[PDB]
């Protein structure tokens, strides 16, 4: 388990070393803030119909009545440029808030604890995650237990022994072909079916697909060996 | 989950067939490109939102031909090979109920691109998700799919709500009969009314209305002598025409900035809905919610996705 | 001999599941896997 | 034995320690042995 984890962290350094696209979202946000700034700058150059883009030149050619017309184009167009960029930015910001609020919830549920939500803390059953800082962002190193070598087995919902019906307390009942066992639902480790592994309800008539086997009782040979202890004190007590 | 991929030629929507208007529009410049970048942003986003909700598994699971699912009769929500498009039964009810203006927009340099995923591809991901859920329980989400007998899955679910697995098996008939009875009402409901789908219809009707309203702003004078560009250009020369055109460019450009601002904002609503739906898939469909009411009222057992026009339906199953 | 092609996207590999009314699969082994997830 | 469960042998667990583990069934039977032995002994008597 430790070796697989060490092997996986190795692959993270390798992955981040190998591809350009990994930090995609963060590199995207930076590109969008810079592109929007340069777009805002570039509207300063636009004439809007005024005889120049350069505000002093206009003063140098027109009086207070005609400069007011030409300048009011640049003010109206420019003010429309700031009202545009700030709208795009208030919207952009609203995307980032939803991202941040998820990232806060993931910090709480994937770092300060272990989530049961499926695929919420990366693909596979969650074990833990390690947070890492980035330019304007966070990276989570999610650690999961992914099933890897499955094998086919026969199963039955329940077992009949004393003509009562029996169920796993936790786990499932499975046959290797020749013998029935009980095991945990998420890793193969078969066990002898016993009273302690199981619980009982009703007779064998209602449960569809129920099968017949023994149930072993760990009290029983502890009393059988105590019956054979008892008989040996009787045979000895026949001797005197 | 998504909406129409609008695309507009801003030059088309401001300056349709005028070079005079084109030269005047260059006095403003990048506003035309900038809006197209914004609409292109939302248009590419639809393929993300639709991948995020449906493409949660990268392998195409399929049903066995035999249907020994303990009496649970999914045939109403699984695909139908007899159909010209392979959706289920319940998905045709969804497609039949949600609804010249579309040509009038087309003449004005407005366009609607098709989504990357065809509605059959959406039915195909849905088929894999649903068949996976039945044949394999949650296990196909967390790793390679492990088969399980359907009543053994249902026992796990019952234990997931702390109800004991014998309480399933001791009533398996009543449970399957109620599951079948409930899907019978899902059909009867979705066949009868259309009001339950009103969330999707209201999303279409807003997007369609915003395109109608943006179209209807072309027929506006804005205080120029005509609402029609050409009727100015026909009547006035290069001194006078420009002043009446510069008003229509201004009024129209303001009318576009407005529609795009509305649509970026609207698209933030749909993205919240996409993220919620992706989570609802990831937790109710690929899992079992311990979250209360998050997968419908009652204790969560399991949920089945069904495709819908630009959206998704979850059929949540609950113990009550 | 490389060229730009066009195709309907195959959504993945096809896989009919080994379902039966009495069949289960169980992992005898597992991988501990780590992923990155990046957030703004 | 009821608070715990059992698997494997002493080699595999890094840092496993030694102690008794109680069995509640043990003196519950052993007192039944003292009860039995008192019957055995009395049956020597007659
Ligand atoms: C299914 O699992 C069964 C339990 O692991 C297994 O049965 C066991 O088979 C071994 C031999 O492979 C037997 O080993 C014993 O054989 C005799 C018993 O008198 C002794 O000489 C040996 O020392 C050893 O104790 C087990 O007795 C037997 N267990 C049981 C409960 O019968 C099956 O072989 C497995 N089936 C398949 C298809 O592999
Ligand atoms: C699983 O094991 C059960 C115990 O062996 C077995 O039950 C037994 O089945 C037979 C046939 O149904 C019964 O046979 C008797 O039936 C009546 C009396 O009730 C007589 O008319 C017959 O001549 C015959 O004697 C056994 O009495 C019955 N015993 C019990 C406790 O069930 C199941 O049939 C087995 N099932 C499978 C699938 O193997
Ligand atoms: C926990 O209890 C264990 C069982 O008593 C105990 O294992 C025993 O430890 C001693 C000392 O390490 C070993 O002593 C013998 O070691 C070799 C033969 O194996 C000889 O060269 C020595 O002379 C000596 O006889 C026992 O063999 C060993 N028994 C077993 C079954 O492994 C652990 O040491 C105890 N651990 C703690 C921390 O209490
Ligand atoms: C899991 O089982 C399926 C089929 O179920 C078993 O198949 C028989 C061979 C036998 O074991 C029966 O008791 C079961 O019903 C396997 O599917 C087979 O796969 C091979 C290719 O590997 C193919 O040639 C066969 O036609 C398939 N048969 C069926 C019925 O699908 C599957 O491979 C098994 N998986 C593992 C990991 O063992
Ligand atoms: C599952 O439910 C469907 C719907 O009732 C059943 O299919 C119908 O079966 C009857 C009897 O053969 C026919 O009259 C209908 O035309 C069928 N409809 C469809 C859509 O196929 C199906 O038989 C049920 N399966 C089980 C195992 O009960
Ligand atoms: C639990 O409630 C169910 C109904 O939800 C009962 O099932 C019905 O029982 C009557 C007879 O009492 C039958 O006529 C119906 O046809 C049954 N319906 C179904 C769908 O099976 C059930 O009897 C109740 N059980 C208990 C123990 O109260
Ligand atoms: C479980 O899987 C791991 C690999 O993921 C197995 O470990 C390998 O075991 C073989 C020998 O069988 C060695 O050659 C490899 O070098 C091992 N790799 C590691 C990381 O140790 C492990 O043995 C498997 N367990 C079982 C029960 O099969
Ligand atoms: C399982 O399927 C077989 C056919 O392959 C059928 O004959 C049998 O009765 C079924 N058993 C159960 C418990 O469903
Ligand atoms: C038999 O019982 C006597 C006491 O009555 C005792 O001394 C002796 O050790 C016992 N022998 C065996 C083999 O149990
Ligand atoms: C615990 O740490 C000490 C060193 O401080 C070491 O000697 C001991 O063997 C360690 N035991 C385990 C189980 O790691
Ligand atoms: C013998 O044992 C019985 C109890 O079973 C007791 O009542 C009786 O007093 C005993 N007699 C002697 C002589 O020990």
Residue numbers in the entry:
A (entry chain B): 923 to 1162
B (entry chain C): 729 to 827, 848 to 1068
C (entry chain B): 689 to 728
D (entry chain A): 1117 to 1162
What does the paper say about this structure?
There were two classes for the Gamma trimer, representing two one-RBD-up conformations. All mutations except for R190S are located near the N-terminal segment and contribute to reconfiguration of its extended structure. T20N has created a new glycosylation site and Asn20 is indeed glycosylated in Gamma. The three RBD mutations (K417T, E484K, and N501Y) in Gamma also produce no major structural rearrangements. The Gamma variant lost binding to the two RBD-2 antibodies (G32B6 and C12A2) and to one NTD-1 antibody (C83B6), but retained binding to the NTD-1 antibody C12C9 with somewhat reduced affinity, suggesting that these two NTD-1 antibodies target overlapping but distinct epitopes. ACE2 did not dissociate more rapidly from the Delta RBD than it did from the Gamma and Kappa RBDs; one possible explanation for the apparently weaker affinity of the Delta trimer for the ACE2 dimer than other variants is that ACE2 binding induces S1 dissociation. These results suggest that the RBD mutations of the Gamma variant enhance receptor recognition, whereas those in Kappa (L452R and E484Q) and Delta (L452R and T478K) have a smaller effect on ACE2 affinity.
SARS-CoV-2 is an enveloped, positive-stranded RNA virus that enters a host cell by fusing its lipid bilayer with the target cell membrane. The fusion reaction is facilitated by the virus-encoded trimeric spike (S) protein after it binds to the host angiotensin converting enzyme 2 (ACE2). S1 contains four domains: NTD (N-terminal domain), RBD (receptor-binding domain), and two CTDs (C-terminal domains), protecting the central helical bundle structure of the prefusion S2. The RBD can adopt either a ‘down’ conformation for a receptor-inaccessible state, or an ‘up’ conformation for a receptor-accessible state; movement of the RBD allows the virus to protect the critical receptor-binding site from host immune responses.
